[PDB]
């Protein structure tokens, strides 16, 4: 029941800004400090700053102090964070976390993926089927930006799945594939439908893999 939910992924052009939302639920929003820490693809965790509950006073890391701006909203129990003068190195997943005195920030947000680029394009979805223990999957080709979530039969199938990390292509657009191992005897009236959601472009392409 207790949870931090933050805003969906976005792209912005070099120079632009972005306000990431983060909404508290289940606990007293006004009792703790709210932190922001980010992670670039090849880096590890980097701390941005924090905003206090009382008086909405703040303190930022010196690496961002000129650019970053944080702000809370009492009524809707949500904390925002705006970063300006966006450069290549700002492409990362951005996390909000409540911090409490003893229990050093035990509750986190899902992360918000931000992509700073001049290049939004929805994904195509082609099936991976055999043509002869067995295996099958979906290729998700040319989308931009990250992320794209893939489930199987609307999250019905999960056991024995493998979604791979997206690879950035020559064309400058991402392509991942997903695959699941499945029974070789269970076939005749048993098909599989991967569901692909991609929010940045607002796409829900669905393809099915039989034989």
Partner 1 sequence: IQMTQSPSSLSASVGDRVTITCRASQGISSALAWYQQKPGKAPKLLIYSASYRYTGVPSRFSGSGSGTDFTFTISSLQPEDIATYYCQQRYSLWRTFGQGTKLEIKRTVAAPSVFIFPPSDEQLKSGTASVVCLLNNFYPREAKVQWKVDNALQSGNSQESVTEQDSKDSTYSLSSTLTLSKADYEKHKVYACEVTHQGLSSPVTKSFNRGES
Partner 2 sequence: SIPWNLERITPPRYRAGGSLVEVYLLDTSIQSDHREIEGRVMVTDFENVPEEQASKCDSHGTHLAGVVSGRDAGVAKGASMRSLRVLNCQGKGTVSGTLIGLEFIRKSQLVQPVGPLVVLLPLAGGYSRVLNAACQRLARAGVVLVTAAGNFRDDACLYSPASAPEVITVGATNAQDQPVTLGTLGTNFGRCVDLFAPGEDIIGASSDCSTCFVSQSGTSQAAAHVAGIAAMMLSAEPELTLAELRQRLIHFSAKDVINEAWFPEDQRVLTPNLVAALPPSTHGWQLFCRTVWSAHSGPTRMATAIARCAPDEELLSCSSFSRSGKRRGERMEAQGGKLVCRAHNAFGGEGVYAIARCCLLPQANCSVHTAPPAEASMGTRVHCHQQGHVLTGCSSHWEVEDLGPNQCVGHREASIHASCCHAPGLECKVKEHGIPAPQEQVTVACEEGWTLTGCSALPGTSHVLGAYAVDNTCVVRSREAVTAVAICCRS
Q: Which residues bind partner 1 (CB under 8 A)?
A: 35, 37, 44-47, 50, 59, 61-62, 95, 97, 102-106, 108-111, 124, 126-131, 133, 135, 137, 139, 141, 162, 164-167, 169, 175-177, 179, 181
Provide CB contacts within 8 A for 208, sequence distance 6+: 127, 191, 192, 193, 194
- As measured in angstroms, the least distance from the Cβ of 135 to partner 2 is 43
Residue 31 sits in the site that holds partner 2 (CB under 8 A): yes
Among 42, 44, 45, 54, binds partner 2 (CB under 8 A): 54
Please say which residue, 32 or 95, places its beta carbon nearer to partner 2: 32
Q: Which does 31 bind (CB under 5 to 8 A by kind): partner 1, partner 2, none?
A: partner 2
Please say which residue, 62 or 75, places its beta carbon nearer to partner 1: 62
Decide: 187 and 111 in contact? Cβ < 8 Å: no
From 82-90, 99-107, 163-171, 179-187, give the range in contact with partner 2 by CB under 8 A.
Answer: 99-107
Partners of 195 in the beta sheet?
151, 206
- As measured in angstroms, the least distance from the Cβ of 103 to partner 2 is 6
CA distance 150 to 134: 20
Q: Which does 54 bind (CB under 5 to 8 A by kind): partner 2, partner 1, none?
A: partner 2
For tokens 């893999």, name the residue: 209
């Amino acid at each position: 029941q207790v949870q931090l939910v933050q805003s969906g992924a976005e792209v912005k052009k070099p120079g632009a800004s972005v306000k990431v939302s983060c909404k508290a639920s289940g606990y007293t929003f006004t009792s703790y400090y709210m932190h922001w820490v980010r992670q670039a693809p090849g880096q590890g965790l980097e701390w941005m700053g924090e905003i206090s509950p009382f008086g909405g006073r703040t303190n930022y890391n010196e690496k961002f102090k000129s650019r970053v701006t944080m702000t809370r909203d009492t009524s809707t129990s949500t904390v925002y964070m705006e970063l300006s003068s966006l450069r290549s190195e700002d492409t990362a997943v951005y996390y909000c976390a409540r911090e409490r005195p003893l229990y050093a920030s035990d509750l986190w947000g899902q992360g918000t993926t931000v992509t700073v680029s001049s290049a939004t394009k929805g994904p195509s979805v082609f099936p991976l089927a055999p043509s002869s223990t067995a295996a099958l999957g979906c290729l998700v080709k040319d989308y931009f930006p990250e992320p794209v979530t893939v489930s199987w039969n609307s999250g019905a199938l999960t056991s024995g799945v493998h979604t791979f990390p997206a690879v950035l292509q020559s064309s400058g657009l991402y392509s991942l594939s997903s695959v699941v191992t499945v029974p070789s005897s269970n076939f005749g009236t048993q098909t599989y439908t991967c569901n692909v959601d991609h929010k940045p472009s607002n796409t829900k392409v669905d393809k099915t893999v039989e034989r």
